[PDB]
Every structure is written in structure tokens, then in C-alpha cells.
């Protein structure tokens, strides 16, 4: 009974939500996220996972400060009014 | 090369234990048969004469 009766015993999560990415990939016993690598300082990325890099790279979010850097450069980082 | 090993592992030993261990390892029979082979080496010359 490795199929249907064994699927009834599944009610204990191995992963919960992660703090940096909100992914539900944070392993409870390992205390590590399997997608972004929290709590390591570097973010988990691999050159074989180029599509995953495309999924989580810069520009897939809000760019709350980086949207204005090109415009401030074009104006020359001016000050005043 | 043999004398290093006796200093390494047989420094603290007495002759009762030494005789017991060589009798249990069978080297004493080899020493006996080597001296015996010397005895028939002399003895065959004596029988020839």
C-alpha cells in the first residue's frame, strides 16, 4: 500500500514560508530556504538555472529606488530647485 | 629493523612471558629445527668417515 493509503498520512509540512522571498521553501528542520538560500548572506542562484535567474532577477519587482537613477543621471545629479 | 620493534613493543617484558609467547607463536620449534639441521650436517660427515 505505497500509493493511495500512503498518501493519506501526509499532514506535516517540510517547508514553510521564507522571509526574503515568501516562497514556501524554508525547510523547517534545516532552517534554510531552498530557493533563495536564507539565512545565508548571498542569494541562491546558479548558471544552470538560467530560467530561475530570469524569474528572480532585477526588474521583476518594483525597483523602488533604481527606477529613478537613470533620470537623476540624465539630469546630472543636480541639487536645489 | 627487527631491533626497532623489540624496543617499540617488547621493552617491558620478562623471560617467563617471553618464553610463553615464543612457544605460543612457534618460533622456538623453528630454532630447534635449525640447530637440528646443523646436527645432521655434522652427523652425515661422521657417518661418511
Amino acid at each position: 500500500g505505497k500509493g493511495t493509503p500512503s498518501f493519506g498520512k501526509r499532514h506535516n509540512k517540510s517547508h514553510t514560508l521564507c522571509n526574503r522571498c515568501g516562497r514556501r521553501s524554508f525547510h523547517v528542520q534545516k532552517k534554510t530556504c531552498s530557493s533563495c538560500g536564507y539565512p545565508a548572506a548571498k542569494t541562491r542562484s546558479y548558471n544552470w538555472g538560467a530560467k530561475a535567474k530570469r524569474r528572480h532577477t532585477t526588474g521583476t519587482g518594483r525597483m523602488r529606488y533604481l527606477k529613478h537613477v537613470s533620470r537623476r543621471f540624465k539630469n546630472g545629479f543636480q541639487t536645489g530647485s | 629493523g627487527k631491533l626497532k620493534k623489540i624496543q617499540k613493543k617488547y621493552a617491558d617484558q620478562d623471560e617467563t612471558e617471553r618464553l610463553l609467547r615464543l612457544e605460543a607463536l612457534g618460533t622456538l620449534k623453528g630454532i630447534e629445527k635449525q640447530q637440528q639441521r646443523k646436527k645432521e650436517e655434522i652427523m652425515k660427515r661422521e657417518v661418511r668417515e
Binding site: - | D12, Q13, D14, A24
Partner: protein
């Protein structure tokens, strides 16, 4: 081939010793000043059972000579020690059972136990139940003592090493048959995970050197060289002789 069972034992994942119900390391009192210039008197408060150990332990209380407090040491109980007995530890201690005299100050034929190898490691030799060390001879110049160990070996150790006079309590245990796989289960359940033992000749050849074949047999000789490597040392390692002697 796979990694064999005795090869897997050294990682210590499930092969660590079960130490939940143990009462502390049974060591001798440290050799400070009193034990090497005079003696010191302590008291046996209780004799207790140690989990996973065949011998009982003794909880001996001394007074700290430098601070107002009490020290509690765990000794291995000698056969004949009772609760409320005064235990004397030191160079000038009288020769009675339970006292912790150094080996330089006991005569010929003395039976001691919990013997230090070097002076100060707080007990190494003759600690299992019913075992003892006999003093075989002294050597004052180059101050050493010869001792007979429970294995029958004769060691030459320092005369400043200490030992508890008498034999370890709880002797004669292994004379009783266990009679039951349940009894062996409860015996090893508090020691470590080394039981039950599957024979390697009953395995598959991926799992052991002895495994495989259309009959259960070893194949090559079971005597293994000392220069063999891990994964090969399964059998009788470096056997000088085999068989039942008569």
C-alpha cells in the same frame, strides 16, 4: 559495492551511545595537594545503579580545602563499600578497601581497581564489574610499579598513579544466561545500536565481502591482514592462530 556496516559505524549517526540516563563520568578525585602530601576524608552518601554499566557507582562527598563548599565525586563502587563509610584518599591513607592510595605506597600482592595509567587521568584500568589489578613488583629507582591487568598482561606504570583498593562490585554477572532475545534487547537498548547482528555471509555481495553465492560460505580465507584497508577488514583481523585449542 556499497559501504559496509562496520564502515558506517564510525560516522556516529545512529551508532552513538545512549547516554540519557547516565549519572556522570565515573572519575577519581583530582590529584591536587592533599592527595599527594597527606590524605582527605569523604563520605559515601549513596550507592546507585548506572544505566548501561554492569557495576554500581558510589557518590562520595568531600570538602573543598580552599573554599567553603562540598564536592561530590562519582566513584566506581568496590565490593564491600557501604553507605556512610568514610573513604580516605591520599598518599598517607591507610590500606583499607575503598581507599585511594597511590601505587607506590602499597606492598606486594595488593589488589586495587580503577587504576590510573599516568598520574592524573582519574581512573583507566580495571573498571568493569569484577575486575582488578594486582601489584606484581616495585622499582624505587626509576620509580615504577609492575602490575597484572585483567587481560593477563603485565604493565609497568608510574608509582604515583592511584588506585582504589579492592575489586569492582557486581562481579559474576556474565555467568547468568540471558535466555532471551528480549533480555539482549534490553541490555543493548541502554548501551548502543549494535544489536541484532546480521551475518555477512547471509547478505548480498554488494553489502559485505562474505555475501553472495549459491551457498552461504565465506569464499576466501577469513583471516585479514593488518595492512588491509577499510571495507576489507571483515573477519578475524591479524589472527596469529585460529581454531579451538585443546
Amino acid at each position: 559495492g556499497r559501504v559496509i556496516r562496520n564502515q558506517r559505524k564510525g560516522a556516529g549517526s545512529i551508532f552513538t551511545s545512549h547516554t540519557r540516563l547516565r549519572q556522570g563520568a565515573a572519575k577519581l578525585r583530582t590529584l591536587d595537594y592533599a592527595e599527594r602530601h597527606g590524605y582527605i576524608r569523604g563520605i559515601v552518601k549513596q550507592i546507585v545503579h548506572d544505566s548501561g554499566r554492569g557495576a554500581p557507582l558510589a557518590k562520595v562527598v568531600f570538602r573543598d580545602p580552599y573554599k567553603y563548599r562540598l564536592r561530590e565525586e562519582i566513584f566506581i563502587a568496590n565490593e564491600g563499600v557501604h553507605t556512610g563509610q568514610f573513604i580516605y584518599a591520599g598518599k598517607k591513607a591507610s590500606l583499607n578497601v575503598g581507599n585511594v592510595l597511590p601505587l607506590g605506597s602499597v606492598p606486594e600482592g595488593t589488589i586495587v581497581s580503577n587504576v590510573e595509567e599516568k598520574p592524573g587521568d582519574r581512573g583507566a584500568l580495571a573498571r568493569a564489574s569484577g575486575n582488578y589489578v594486582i601489584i606484581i613488583g616495585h622499582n624505587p629507582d626509576e620509580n615504577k610499579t609492575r602490575v597484572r591487568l585483567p587481560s593477563g598482561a603485565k604493565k609497568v606504570i608510574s608509582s604515583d598513579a592511584r588506585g582504589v583498593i579492592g575489586v569492582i562490585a557486581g562481579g559474576g554477572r556474565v555467568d547468568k544466561p540471558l535466555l532471551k532475545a528480549g533480555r539482549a534487547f534490553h541490555k543493548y537498548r541502554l548501551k548502543r545500536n549494535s544489536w541484532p547482528k546480521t551475518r555477512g555471509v547471509a547478505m548480498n555481495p554488494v553489502d559485505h565481502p562474505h555475501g553472495g553465492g549459491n551457498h552461504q560460505h565465506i569464499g576466501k580465507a577469513s583471516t585479514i591482514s593488518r595492512g588491509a584497508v577499510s571495507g576489507q577488514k571483515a573477519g578475524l583481523i591479524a589472527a596469529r592462530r585460529t581454531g579451538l585449542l585443546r
